[PDB]
Amino acid sequence: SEVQLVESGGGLVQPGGSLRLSCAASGFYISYSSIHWVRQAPGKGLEWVASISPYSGSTYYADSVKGRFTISADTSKNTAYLQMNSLRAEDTAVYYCARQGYRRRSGRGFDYWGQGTLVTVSSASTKGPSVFPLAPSSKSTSGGTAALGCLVKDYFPEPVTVSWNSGALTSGVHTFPAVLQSSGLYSLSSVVTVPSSSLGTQTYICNVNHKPSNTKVDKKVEPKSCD
Amino acid sequence: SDIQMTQSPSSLSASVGDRVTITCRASQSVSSAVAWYQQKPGKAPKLLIYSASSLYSGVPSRFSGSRSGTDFTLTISSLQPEDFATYYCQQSYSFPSTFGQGTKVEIKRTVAAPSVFIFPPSDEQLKSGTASVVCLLNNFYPREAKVQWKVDNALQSGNSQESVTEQDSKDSTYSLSSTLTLSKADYEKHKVYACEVTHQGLSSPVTKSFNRGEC
RNA sequence: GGUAAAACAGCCUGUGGGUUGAUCCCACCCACAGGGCCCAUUGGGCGCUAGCACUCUGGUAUGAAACACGUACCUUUGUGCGCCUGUUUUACC
């Protein structure tokens, strides 16, 4: 589509720190529209954050961010902004920019949304994962089906990607949502179920990429040597 | 006083072709300034309905919205596979705006018992002083499942975390991983590590276990 | 009897008592008792399909537009004008 919103400026920030998000519009001019910010904590619902009205520049805020966040818009740059101060852990979320559409066409509905940008508020420092194998066994079978995987432990912040055999292996793969551990670091597993008879001849490699730390790990997952 | 939008149900299981109705009840007048959105995992929301009952351009006619006073409904007359998603209402009658809590619409199918697998910690991880024991519940339905960890037949509590995949696009099942975390010193105190799984598709709980250090 | 003018009273309904005329007798007043409808409610207002103006309270629609701005409206508060009834007057017939 020609109409696009692109959020940028997300990333890691310490509690009490500040971040400015940007929302760059393409295919339309924001000066004829209201622009809104909406956020979504991991696994939770949409939460409206702030908005700015055309021609007046009037601004509105959710009670949850009142006094800490400031929304603004630059007509010449065709870009909206969200200045966020005094950030707390509970502000961790994907932040979306959204266009309120044209009144005659879609009322007050928000007709275009950006892809969103992740903001993580934590005292933890960026850290790449340790990748450990989840080895298969012949004693651990569901019929003629074995399971194996990779445990992707102690990384920060989100996200990580996992593929198998450089994307050649997709069937039967389950890569689980990360959990935030009490240490403040994330962990996830990625598994695949394969034929038991394949275990001796077929090779399995999980490819783990953690862009925030510029970390890439390839881990071969093999049956234990005694097996 | 901020306007509340109380959305129900929080989750719905329906078969392809079923009619579903999602309700959003405002705590004050919002006139007809209510919008409905669809959102799929990892994706931005998409507008469906604006002004409580108007279909947004390009949205299929099987979606409809209605207002009765301060109660609002979204109806899908016949679910198609691409319609299984989360749905949100929104009031934009006054500031601050309010989204409803969401309704996740998931695919109903026949019961499927999980395939269960238990993974000892790797020797590599152990060298660093921590043991992660992983239990996999593969391709089951419905989502509700109970995992219990036992260590030499002692029930564990508080030292495990789990997560669940989104419903599989091909077979409509779920999978679940549970991770039990121990210090290496604590791990070496015990022999039998067991994952006990309860699920509607199992007539009695299934236990998968290993003896620490066995092949 | 009527005509005209400036006033006074009227949310709705009682129950007493007074007023001031000998009695009477309504009008006014007073007290009390209720019963509605509305508003911006520690309180305030309501004679009116006879409404109008401005002003506020809260709203609608629209201009690429929730506020602000422009346009066209609705509503409420207050004020003034108008109107109805009842009664008392003054000028006139």
Author numbering:
A (entry chain H): 3 to 229
B (entry chain L): 1 to 215
What does the literature reporting this entry say, word for word?
Enteroviruses contain conserved RNA structures at the extreme 5′ end of their genomes that recruit essential proteins 3CD and PCBP2 to promote genome replication. Previously, the phylogenetic and biochemical probing analyses have proposed that the domain I (called replication-linked RNA, REPLR hereafter) folds into a cloverleaf-like RNA secondary structure with a base-stem, sA, and three stem-loops, sB, sC and sD. Here, we determined the crystal structures of the coxsackievirus B3 and rhinoviruses B14 and C15 REPLRs at 1.54, 2.2 and 2.54 Å resolution, revealing a highly conserved H-type four-way junction fold with co-axially stacked sA-sD and sB-sC helices that are stabilized by a long-range A•C•U base-triple. For this, we prepared two crystallization constructs for each REPLR by replacing the wild-type sB or sD loop with a Fab BL3–6 binding tag, 5′ GAAACAC 3′, which enabled Fab−RNA complex formation for each crystallization construct and allowed subsequent crystallization of the complex.
To access the potential influence of the Fab binding tag sequence and subsequent Fab binding on the H-shaped conformation, we crystallized and determined the structure of the same CVB3 REPLR using the same Fab-assisted crystallography approach, but this time, the Fab-binding tag replaces the sD loop rather than the sB loop. Both sD and sB loop mutant constructs for crystallization (designated CVB3-DLmut and CVB3-BLmut, respectively) bound the Fab BL3–6 similarly, indicating that sD and sB loops are equally accessible to the Fab, consistent with the H-shaped topology and antiparallel positioning of the sB and sD loops as observed in our previous CVB3–BLmut crystal structure. The CVB3 REPLR crystal structure reported here with the Fab-binding motif engineered in the sD loop also exhibits the same topology, supporting that the enteroviral REPLRs have modular subdomain structures with the sB and sD loops distal to each other, not favoring tertiary interactions between these loops. In the bulge of the CVB3-DLmut construct, the U49 is flipped out, and A50 forms a base triple involving the A50, C48 and G82 through hydrogen bonding interactions, where C48 and G82 form the Watson-Crick base pair, the A50 Sugar-Edge interacts with C48 O2 and G82 N2, and the A50 N1 contact G82 2′OH through a hydrogen bonding. This bulge structure was slightly different in the previously reported CVB3–BLmut construct, where U49 remained within the helical stack and was involved in the U49•G51–C78 base-triple formation, and the A50 flipped out of the helix and interacted with the symmetry-mate Fab molecule, which is further stabilized by the hydrogen bonding interactions of the G51 O4′ and A50 N3 with the A50 2′OH. Nevertheless, these structural variations may reflect a high dynamicity of the bulge, and thus, each crystal structure perhaps represents a sampled conformation of the bulge within these CVB3 REPLR crystal structures.
